[PDB]
Amino acid sequence: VLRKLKSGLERGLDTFDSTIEIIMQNLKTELESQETENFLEQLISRIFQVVSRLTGVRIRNVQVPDITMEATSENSANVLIPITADVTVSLPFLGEIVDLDLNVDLQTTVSIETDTEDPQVVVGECTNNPESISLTVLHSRFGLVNDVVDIGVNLARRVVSSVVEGELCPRFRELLESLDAECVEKLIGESQ
Amino acid sequence: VLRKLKSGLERGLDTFDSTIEIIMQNLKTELESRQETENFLEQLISRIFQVVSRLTGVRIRNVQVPDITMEATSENSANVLIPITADVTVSLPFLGEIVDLDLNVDLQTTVSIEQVVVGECTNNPESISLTVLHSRFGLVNDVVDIGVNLARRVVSSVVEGELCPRFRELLESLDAECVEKLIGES
Ligand SMILES: CCCCCCCC/C=C\CCCCCCCC(=O)O
Ligand SMILES: CCCCCCCC/C=C\CCCCCCCC(=O)O
Ligand SMILES: [Ca+2]
Ligand SMILES: [Ca+2]
Ligand SMILES: [Ca+2]
């Protein structure tokens, strides 16, 4: 069972590693003003390093290729965060059952309230859509068509889904809420 | 890995099921009045393996003793042979049932008259035979090997810890004349 991960996610994975909180604060200050993506790679790696200690799902080599902003209207934009990582699933007695490529696309919206010189920022929902999590099989020492692979892919999906809901989406919203209203207004500007 | 079985074997598997000791006593009385003894042995061994099923994901049932044979080695000594057959299923976490095996175990000890002496009951790995019948995960891949290895270790530790000692204990309960009468059949 993923009991250990479920209890860990209830507490917050940051209760297992003091450095997550520090990286969060580094991201806050950096956002006031290439490097932000580097700080995000660090935050996500450390969260996944804690998941590696609680589960046999080991997620390494975390990259954020490019953070994009697409204007949805004059006063709203989607903020897009593409994540890649290498995944290996291990079970007791069997050791390494499968190596996967992971793609996660986190999306959230920022809006500015219309008809005011003192605009309020609203950050929308961070939806954990199963279509946003992609797992590709690279290798299994048991054979690619073996049933262990399917169990491996399923276990990885559950872990990744639960840490998107429990950690990444909440921190994505928390980091957007740290932006001053003018900064958001300026960034939603020339998203057009 | 097998901690729970190892702790179980140190206590005695009969501390988990009051019926084992009753079946032991049934076998003792039944012997004094020398199929049926084999039926009591099937029951004793099933129950020991029912306890092992509670301590491990190695489930052993359909336990049979085809025929107990005694071959006279001299006028006052014989080899006593007990063939055991059983169906085995190994389960692991997340995978569930990984393999179904056929188990054959051949226990051998000697009984002599001095005073009855029962010889050692040797746990030879050649005396435990495990045959693959079915696997969800392929017949010759590494899942099966892990399954067969776990079953061997469990069966080996239960032979050493429970079956061989009970085999010796039951033979040592026979009086000298009983053994002389049974060796009577070379
Ligand atoms: C665990 C995931 C946390 C994600 C936190 C994201 C915080 C950063 C948010 C917004 C950055 C500003 C948008 C930049 C748009 C310009 C385009 C570019 O940078 O290439
Ligand atoms: C766990 C194993 C315990 C074994 C206890 C040993 C019991 C042996 C009993 C009697 C031996 C007499 C053998 C005579 C041959 C004919 C018997 C027969 O085949 O039915
Ligand atoms: Ca650290
Ligand atoms: Ca498959
Ligand atoms: Ca949380």
Numbering used by the authors:
A (entry chain A): 38 to 70, 80 to 238
B (entry chain B): 38 to 71, 80 to 159, 166 to 237
Give the published text.
Further investigation of BSP30 revealed that it is a mixture of two closely related proteins—BSP30a and BSP30b, sharing 83% amino acid identity, with expression restricted to salivary tissue.
We have also solved the structure of BSP30b in complex with oleic acid which shows that the hydrophobic channel can sequester one molecule after co-crystallization. Only the helix α3 moves slightly away. From our BSP30b-oleic acid structure, it is obvious that, unlike the changes proposed for SPLUNC1, no major conformational change is needed for lipid binding.
